[model samples]
Structures are given as C-alpha cells and as structure tokens.
Target chain A: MDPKHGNLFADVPVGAPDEIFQPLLERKGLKIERIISNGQASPPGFWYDSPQDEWVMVVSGSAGIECEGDTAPRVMRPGDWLHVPAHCRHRVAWTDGGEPTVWLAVHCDA
Target chain B: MDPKHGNLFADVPVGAPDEIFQPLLERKGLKIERIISNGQASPPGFWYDSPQDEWVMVVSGSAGIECEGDTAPRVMRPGDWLHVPAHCRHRVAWTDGGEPTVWLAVHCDAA
Candidate 1:
C-alpha cells in the first residue's frame, strides 16, 4: 500500500498571486501547516494578534517577520526558526518574490 | 537586539559517533527537537515504545522507519513527514551514512 504521509515540497503551486497555506494536521489543540509565500506581506500598519502561540521555521527561500514593539523585523532564511507567544502582535514584512518561500508552522494553545 | 531564536541547520555537528538530539523548546506538554544522525540505526531487534506521540519530518538526507507489524519500513526523504501514535512500537531501520540526516521532531501529549 502507498504511504499515508505527504511531502511539504511536492506538488507546490508556483506563481500564485497570494500566499498559500496548507493544513497538515489538526489535533489536540495544535495545528501543523505548510505556508508558501511569494513576495506577500501583511498590509501596512497591520498585525496578527493571534490567540495561539506559533513556532515557525523556514524550509527554503527567505522572509521577514516583525513583532509589535520591535524596531526592526527578524529576517529569516532557510532553517531559521522562531517562536511567537500567544497574543503577540506580528506581521510578515516581506517574502522572496523570485522563488517560493516555504515555511512550516506549528500553532498551539497556551 | 539579537534575536533569541535559532536555526536548525546551523552549527550541525558532524562526525559524531552517535546520533545527536538538540532540544529546541519545551512548553505545555509539547517538546520540539532537532535530531542529527550520521547513518545511525536502532539496535537489532529493538523497538522504541514511548508514552508521547511523535510527528517528525526530514529536513535533509534520508532514513527509514518501521512501525510495529509493518511489513516494510517507510523510506523518508527531505520534506517527508510522518505521525507515530503514542506507544506505537517503531525503529529506525537505516539512515544515510554518507552525509548528515537532519530531522525535526515534535513530541506532544494526547489532548
């Protein structure tokens, strides 16, 4: 029988107009997802104040994340990981436009 | 200010005699780790039975995992992720020896 698991890098849709998020698993107050971005950014003066904490890592390409009260954004490249506590206001400042920027994110309730 | 976050692929120790596991975070019944293997496999006839469930993905290199009663092992390459339920007997059958095999693993308690 074929394996039941899926690959994050396989079957990616290129040249999408907006960022794409694919849910991988949802169980026990946690959600795992794969996010693909191509030069998308949070709207100006916008922040995501999520109720759940998130730990994310960059699989390939590059991006930047800015947290509230931070003077500058945290630049992320392949392998970089960061944790955002619950209710922490943050936003994606930028993502690579030349290639797909892939991220793996795990969201958990506090 | 310098960020407190980390990179999984940075500072990877190679040529170790055994597999290396680096703890990334611990919070609220969840633990994340970066495991580095240099062709290490579980001992013959051995299986790992743990209390917590595990979700793992290969960041680089390759390996094989066999679950209890499985006729054959699951060969994993980059970006391949699998979920192993709690107390499910499993073993690492083989890992690539020519280079480092990096894995990201999350251990979570049943909710």
Candidate 2:
C-alpha cells in the first residue's frame, strides 16, 4: 500500500495483492495486514497466539471454521464474517483448493 | 460501558452516555474511548504531545481548527474527520458553546 498522507479520515489507497499472506501494513500494536493463502497447509489443528483481538474480513474466496473437537465446520465465503477472539482455539477445517483465499486482518489491540 | 464478552467479532452492546468527558474505555497502547466535551475549554492554544498518530472522528457537535501560523480556523461539525499525524502542531480555534461535543478517538501506534 502507498504510504498514506494527510488526514486519518482519508481512505488511503490500500494496494491489491496477488499472493497469499502478503502483509499490507506491519507495525507494533496495529497491523493492517492482508493475506492470500491457498488450500495447502492449514493452520494448527488446535489453538493459536495473538496478543490483541483481530478483526478479519473475507475479501474473497471461501473457507470454513472448525472449533476444537468439532467434526463439522461451518462453511464461509464472501460477506461471511467472524471475529476471532484472542486465544480462541479454532482451526481451518476445510477450503476449496481450486480458488485462492483473500482476506484483510486488522489487529488494533496488540 | 458494560465490559465486553464473547468473541472479538462480536460487538457487545456499546452503551450510550449521559454526560461529557466520561471515557467509555481506558487503557494503555490502545484506547477505544469516547468523550462528551462541552464547547467551553478546548484542546490547547499551541502545539501538543502524543506518541501515536490519532484518528479522531467528530461524532457530534461543531468546532474549529487552527494550525500554527494559520490565518483562520476551519469549522468542523458532525461527521467531520481529521487525521492528525504524529507530532503535527495544531489547535482548536473555535466551537459553539451551546451544545456538547461527542468524539471517538482511536490511537494504535506505538511503533
């Protein structure tokens, strides 16, 4: 993304991404990051670590969420949103390998 | 406001306010806070100090802004927004003293 100038009310031009897990902005407490992970290696089957709570929006593609010990995962796609709490144990249960997963992860609480 | 619960994705009922200068939430590094300030006393006459850049939205009321050596103050009302960059010297020029000012400030830079 271009280095934002002027006021914070301005919607700076956040560039587009072509690959998965490409970070848009990486800083200390706040990270306006983006990712485009394909269907291959999934996250840990159990829980994870994040200092602050995260707000992740499904910009494109599709996937599902599976909680610990749950057999079936809830399907997701564009417009489907979820707020993953800090330290909530959940895993990526399924995804369509044919498509790419594009998302924006904003962590302001770090 | 009531302490939040459940997922971070969940917007756990941010409560309404009744007075001014009362913060909704207060913490270091990150403050998802609110303020209801009357139009009497204002920010400052000169410059200021803040570690992180600020994203302030004029949730309600009206005011004016005067930068260092600026000729006139820019009038601001509800829905007005400004991103004061880190260490930028600016000050409140004017505001109507009849109503209260409600603003939300989110500062997330400790970089």
Candidate 3:
C-alpha cells in the first residue's frame, strides 16, 4: 500500500539539519515545533512571553536541554520526555551531535 | 550510526502482525500497550477493571477504536489521537487492516 493509504511515516525534515530556531506550529497559546541539528551549535539563552507550559519529547532523536539556574543539564534521547514549567529560561545546548536530531516540542497553558 | 550508539528507532514488534491483546507497560493504574493486525479478526468486547482514563494515539500506524454504546466508531491514524475517559468499554474493531498496525495507548489516574 502507498503511504497515502497506510500510516507508515516517512522521515520529515522538520527543519535545517544544522540550524535551529524554526517555528513549526502556532495556535494562539499552543506551539509545537521541531528542532534539528547536526553540529555542536548553541541556540543561546532566551525566554518565551506566552507564559505557557512546555512539554518536549525526543521523538526518534536526542538533544540536551539546559536552564538558566541549573548547573547540570538534562540529556534526552528517544523515549525520553520532559515537562518544563512556563517562563523557564532555557536553551538547547547541542542537537543531533552530527546525526539528524528531531525533537517534538509542544507548549500550552492548559 | 549503529542503533545502540544513536537514538535511531528501529521497528519494534509491539505485537503479532495479525494478533492483539499484548500488554506492554503496566504501572499501578497506568497501562500502555500496542495492537497490530493484518487480517479481519475481532478480539471481541472486554472491559478493563481499572477506572483510569486512557489516552490513545495512533503512533506511526492506524486502527479503529469502538466503544460499547457508540454507533459511530472512531478511526485513528498517525498523528490522530484520542482521549477516552475512564471505563470507556472499547475494543479494537480491526487492527492494521492489511499491513502492520501500531497504536500507543496510555492509561493513568491522578489519584
């Protein structure tokens, strides 16, 4: 059966394999985006204004998430998930690490 | 890259290609399982004892979830998810259809 009929998922290029900061889904307060990286590049530190809670999962990928106040960062891989409270200043330390990284991130108030 | 070195997700046999009713994860009141089918065969209707809410999603596959009272069954596909309140009394109508079907189902309770 063709992909149109079956639910077989093909590899989707959520964004550049070497760059980040590309927003994918935006609906009022809910935002779902993917971050892909292939090298040791940092996204710098930033915060969101929506004050919405964030839930990120390494969907068939891996990455490192670090907060401003925490000394140790959290390393995530496939099947590993995280829930970040609203307004938490954080950044992506490094993504993919030379391989294609795909992280599904969703933010919501509810 | 090797599957062990990277987070590359190889296909997992969550269950038989044409059979169902294989429990994968069970933690207290939370239960996670997978359903796969390749032919037309129903597991019949059965109810779970736990009164926990279930959040089921069609992860990389498709299938039909039917309840005891609803005439219109809900069909789920990849990215299409559903939340069944506690004790929905539902069953898998037919899994996979002709190919391999994989559904990630999670059950939980706050208390």
Better structure of 1 and 2 per DockQ: 1
Residue-wise C-alpha lDDT for candidate 1, range A70-91, written one tens digit per residue: 8898999999999888888889
The RMSD of every model to the true structure, in order and in angstroms, is 2.4, 8.7, 9.2
Q: Quick one: best lDDT, which candidate? A: 1
Please report, as a residue range, the 10-residue window in candidate 2 chain A with the lowest summed lDDT. A1-10
Candidate of highest DockQ: 1
What candidate 1 gets wrong by more than 4 Å, as runs, is A1-3, B1-3
Which residue pairs clash in candidate 3?
none
Positional deviation of residue A30's Cα in model 1 after best superposition, in angstroms: 1.1
For A1-110, candidate 3 gives per-residue lDDT tens digits of: 00111121234445544555344434344444555555544555453333655666665556777766657667777645555666666677766655666555555563
Evaluated on the second chain alone, the candidates' TM-scores are 0.93, 0.66, 0.64
Model 1 lDDT tens row, B1-111: 222589988888787889999988677878889999999999998998777778899998899999887899988998999877778878999988888999999888745
For each candidate, the DockQ is: 0.46, 0.13, 0.08
Docking class of 2: incorrect
What is the DockQ score of candidate 2, to 2 decimals? 0.13
TM-score for each candidate, following the candidate numbering: 0.92, 0.46, 0.47
lDDT string for model 3 (B33-72, tens) is 5544554445555544346555555655567767666775
Local distance difference test values of all predictions, in order: 0.85, 0.51, 0.53
Shift of residue A18 alpha carbon in model 1, Å:
2.1
Instruction: Write one digit per residue (lDDT tens) for candidate 2, span B1-111.
Output: 111312211232233223344333334565544555555444455564466665554545667765544566666675454555566556666555766666555565636
lDDT, candidate 2, A1-110, per-residue tens? 11122222233223323244544444566655545656643545556456566655454567776645556776767534455556655666655476666555556662
Determine which window of 10 residues in candidate 3 chain B has minimal summed lDDT: B1-10
